[PDB]
Paper text:
Polyomaviruses are small double-stranded DNA (dsDNA) viruses with a circular genome of approximately 5,000 bp. All glycan-binding polyomaviruses analyzed to date engage oligosaccharide (glycan) structures featuring terminal sialic acids that in mammals are usually presented either on gangliosides, which are molecules composed of a glycosphingolipid, i.e., a ceramide and an oligosaccharide, or on glycoproteins, which contain mostly complex and branched oligosaccharides attached to amino acids during co- and posttranslational modification steps. These sialylated glycan structures interact with loop regions at the outer margin of the major capsid protein VP1, at the apical surface of the polyomavirus capsid, as revealed by X-ray crystallography and cryoelectron microscopy. The VP1 surface exhibits an astonishing plasticity, providing virus-specific interactions for a range of Neu5Ac linkage types and further specific characteristics of Neu5Ac-containing glycans.
In order to enable an understanding of their structural features and receptor-binding strategies, we expressed and purified VP1 pentamers of NJPyV and HPyV12 and solved X-ray structures of both native and liganded proteins. As expected, both proteins feature the conserved jelly-roll fold typical for polyomavirus VP1. Our structure-based sequence analysis shows that the BC2 loop of HPyV12, which essentially mediates all interactions with Neu5Ac, is especially highly conserved in several animal viruses. In HPyV12 VP1, the BC2 loop comprising the Neu5Ac-binding site is formed by amino acids T69 to Q83 (T73 to E87 in TSPyV VP1), whereas the putative binding sites in ShPyV VP1, GhPyV VP1, and FiPyV VP1 include amino acid residues T61 to Q75, T57 to E71, and T58 to E72, respectively.
Residue numbers in the entry:
A (entry chain AAA): 29 to 37, 39 to 98, 105 to 299
B (entry chain BBB): 29 to 37, 39 to 98, 106 to 298
C (entry chain CCC): 30 to 37, 39 to 98, 105 to 298
D (entry chain EEE): 29 to 99, 105 to 298
E (entry chain DDD): 28 to 299
């Protein structure tokens, strides 16, 4: 594709969306929405059979764009994105673990943040901590696309997929593919540990540039804008025991798009 | 509004203000002002009934501005400071102690945010638990919409404006990134039970309030809207293991300029 | 009313070390550079700390060279260094020990601040507890105003100037961001009971003191006002579990230039 | 070489992509513990320290042959690289057969981390250095003993302990450092964070370019039309629920190197 | 003071000087089986009986590198000095701390406990020895014979626990100036650039970055680097990574790592 000049003047639009987290309890009518079910630990490598509701997933949405049609395409220039609800973790009166008469123990542990903006679905590369996990039916996992062997514990280049279903691609089996995603920008960070404190910043003043080194943003070839994210804040522990749940937060996107002339 | 040129020459004014923390003991005559009451923890998810004095709140105020009329005061920049980190170096108070060591200082989860705008801060409701029973006299998501499990994620019906000091609990309200066109907000959160608090302080740092088009917040009705919350963690008195939130005050020095608008 | 800088003669460097005032403020005392052992109150109403158990601000007024529309010395920039982090690598002293391991080094809360100005640092009073009974011979909020629960937040009547070395406790006084027009201050705080101390040192970093208009602090009466505090945490001697504040000295090298004024 | 001007236009730029798999000790892709070490055993004495090859992490390396460009000569010059450590998301699996506290989650991978990558026009130069001069390294590895007499000097800088990274999965990280006194024609980057239970930290993106040009605007020159990639990415230790024995866990690294044709004398 | 004139240009106006400085952690003898470590640290039974053996404390490393001779004709109204423009410096051997199979402390069947605790990194490049300011945690320590400590240069009193401006020395001997008694002096070192960082704690994880792509500029605010007096380049460092604990007990040893320097120098004219 030949990328020609930007249009000027009617030539800009803003697309906003909130994506809700898909932490395992993905049903908005369930009392534990925004969390996983209680995590259970395998008795052996060969008996590792996690239920769908115990794992966190990627969130994704395709936003329809105004129709345009040289050819014109919407070009994503920049995004303001925000993870909403760190303030909710300041609740330490809920039914939580307690030391003596101290406050309820807040959400802590491993965190995983990523967002992406693109003109087509996010490209995913499969990879697993254990090749022996028996994933439940009704997900997309590396077994969905290739023969799973010990190679999946490193880089098996046959384990390719696209993020095309909200709440069904587990984060534990799928990474953004750095060998593809020519038409997507993705950003993420991971911080491990069992009891690590979570960290978040929030503002409406920070713009993420989506232009590549040539000044070109993602091009929305199909009249669709693709938003993807995951925002795991750590584990919650209810006062009913020592079982833990993943806790995730929603993410806002406000994407600025401009009309770009193109030729095949 | 079509924004026109800035004025030059009496064209600039500074607004100086502070907001005291609203940590639950919000009465300046109470011996525990600047703290919450002792935090109690629910016996069940269905019996979670926190008293108003045990939770921290947003602070807010509207500063009246010189009447201009059109002209609007435009907020260009702010110097803001959280005052009092020095006070946490008191380890001789009636505090928990290991053997004959110092008093255990304030530690735990921190929540810092400030906002400067030309109208009240837009809030989005969100909660850790949809089953919490909030006390009478507060503004919570239940004040504006039916509260269901959707409130644990993003329920777009849970919209409010920060329009009362010490009444909007931080645990139920986020700054709304989908609104606040006429406000700049900034914040950071760090969790954990015993995490060390961190603060910087200086009079040399200016926060720019101009947007990408070089336009600051425009003060509707000649009012400047300031908002904040500065939770430093929990204090533990030597009388037991019960903990209290501890907050600190925030200073604002806002530079405003006159901006013509259509 | 600030006019043009002079050129050519027209620059001077002023150097000083300020020794820490950690409570043992007497350079002939064997515990100089430390506090006395910290005792913890038995009750909120019986909190009576001896002067030697609390850290203080350090300060000095450095007389300046002759230079006389008048001229004033304008502070352009400073190189400042906390000296002695290397001393904390001593783990063979009479210290707490785990089995046959090293002596437990200084850890805990840190408070660093420095200021350079043309008049004394303006201080705002604020306290963790309004009920502390401060000893005689200090300057505390009680020295300037009625102490009430308001002092746990911002009581704007609690104003003072840092005009005595080793007498203004850090636990009752913050640099005042509503004043200090003619001073630049910088500080950071990191809490916790056993947090590791962190320090950088170099002779290659210059702190600029010029404001947004290119004007540095102007030295009234030809005096340069330096202020600091550098608490590194607590030391624990092998004689028990009682702890002492440990502080380090700070070096300043301020570049001044001659400035014409009305 | 006298370095002359860059070439311009159609065909003057090429991109080389590769994934390098980690060599954590279990280096066989058919083994059920691929991407991990074998269970780490600790010496009973300084003089009985005999680690099996499968219990130690290694440098990964590959030489990628480049397009034909000659018939002044031209060399491919590495300008920049996008590199990514893949798979931090896999550490969010806390349901596997792992240690747990009461009914809490499986204890995830934690501990010491070692990240390094290098891009060059010849093999990475290595400097030998060891925690203990008394370790008895197993047959089939390349260690300082391979190139010099090992003495207590190896616990500091013994300048006789020089080697080139010329074999994947055979140079243990615990005996070899990138040599800052050589590597004129390679750029290397790394970070280390120690501790027994330290949380691992990783960022990932496709928007960050690492510039490989030196102070004179010259990148690594592929003197033999080969691009040399090297790395190690230790994430910490994994603990299986079968015991308290630990395994190193590593992750693969992606490289996408931009090269341009450079005239040389 | 040296009156600085123009930089020279062209062939042979530039040279690069490289060196490795080995750490001096207490076991300073390269033939000793614990080279690069301290002897096992012992803790005083009282403030008045604090008598540390010289092998139990880390020291500053230093070297003077000879430079090409510049000034054979001392009648000239202008002379030349080597000016240090920049340095690439690297602490080598963080990878060695990934050895957790050595004879080390262990929890159950877990890995050997690696080096952790307080870190102290510093390096300096100058045209004369690094200026040192004495300062101590305790004025009562009895230092062993054959070291240079504040007592070597002044009367040691409680003042030494803060800033005693009489405690001045120059870093002129490798492995003899303990880090616990000497700081780089910010009131001198006009002709040296120094850089350091300290992180405390008993079990803090050590942190290190390494690369060959980072240049440290040595030019001052006037564009002038250190000027090499007597055609000597002075390098100084210390790189304590924490404490090692052998499986023979709970006694701990300091562990240090070597540092590389590659200094770019240029000829600078000065008034004679």
């Amino acid at each position: 594709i030949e990328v020609l000049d930007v249009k000027t003047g009617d030539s800009i639009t803003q697309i906003e969306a909130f994506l809700n987290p898909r932490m395992g309890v993905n049903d908005e009518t369930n009392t534990w929405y925004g969390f996983s079910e209680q995590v259970t630990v395998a008795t052996a490598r060969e008996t590792d059979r996690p239920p769908k509701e115990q794992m966190p997933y990627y969130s994704c949405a395709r936003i329809p764009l105004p129709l345009l049609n040289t050819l014109l395409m919407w070009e994503a220039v920049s995004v303001k994105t925000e993870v909403i609800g760190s303030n909710t973790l300041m609740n330490v009166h809920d039914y939580m673990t307690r030391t003596d008469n101290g406050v309820g123990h807040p959400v802590v542990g491993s965190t995983y943040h990523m967002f992406a903006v693109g003109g087509e679905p996010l490209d995913l590369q499969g990879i697993q901590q254990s090749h022996l996990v028996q994933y439940p039916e009704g997900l997309i996992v590396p077994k969905s696309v290739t023969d799973v062997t010990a190679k999946i514990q490193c880089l098996d280049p046959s384990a390719k997929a696209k993020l095309d279903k909200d709440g069904k691609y587990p984060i534990e089996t799928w990474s953004p593919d750095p060998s593809r995603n020519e038409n997507t920008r993705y950003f993420g960070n991971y911080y491990g540990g069992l009891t690590t404190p979570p960290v978040l910043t929030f503002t409406n003043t920070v713009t993420t540039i989506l232009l590549d080194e040539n000044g070109v943003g993602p091009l929305c070839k199909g009249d669709g804008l693709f938003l993807s994210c995951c925002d795991v804040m750590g584990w919650f522990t209810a006062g009913s025991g020592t079982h833990q749940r993943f806790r995730g937060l929603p993410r806002y996107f406000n994407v600025q798009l401009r009309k770009r002339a193109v030729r095949n």
